[PDB]
Design a protein around this ligand. Sequence first.
Ligand SMILES: [Zn+2]
Ligand SMILES: [Zn+2]
Lengths: 69, 44, 57
Amino acid sequence: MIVPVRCFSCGKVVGDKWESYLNLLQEDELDEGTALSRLGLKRYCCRRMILTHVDLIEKFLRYNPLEKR
Amino acid sequence: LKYICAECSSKLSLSRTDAVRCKDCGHRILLKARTKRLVQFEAR
Amino acid sequence: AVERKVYPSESRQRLTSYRGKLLLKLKWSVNNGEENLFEVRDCGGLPVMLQSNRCHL
Ligand SMILES: [Zn+2]
Ligand SMILES: [Zn+2]
């Protein structure tokens, strides 16, 4: 749903890396493997976490029962 | 203000034998609001 | 008190059925046309297929 905090296998913090990773692909126009490297994700353990994350939460958030649409 | 309208989202409260409906919309479906209360969890 | 649309989410939350009014135009013909009466009849709430030409989505 939202970025996981740690990499499942490494233990390495990964949750501070989602918003930046998107900005790398978007703004700096890098490919995925270059951007992952720039964020320090070396082990394929860790590259997998950010490479394949689906920010499904951003869908959930569009249904907010506490505001007049 | 215990309840919330499911359609217009107006926060509102009820009483003893009161119109089970939004006082703005007239929609007859109301969500019970989460109010300040202690629930305890273990971070595991 | 004039009609308002019902969307399927409401049906899901109320745990009832998502239905539209089924109307029949009844022809009541006396003596082979000599005198025929018409009346449109409310034949109940007919469950409607979601995302079809009778659904509001
Ligand atoms: Zn990893
Ligand atoms: Zn309302």
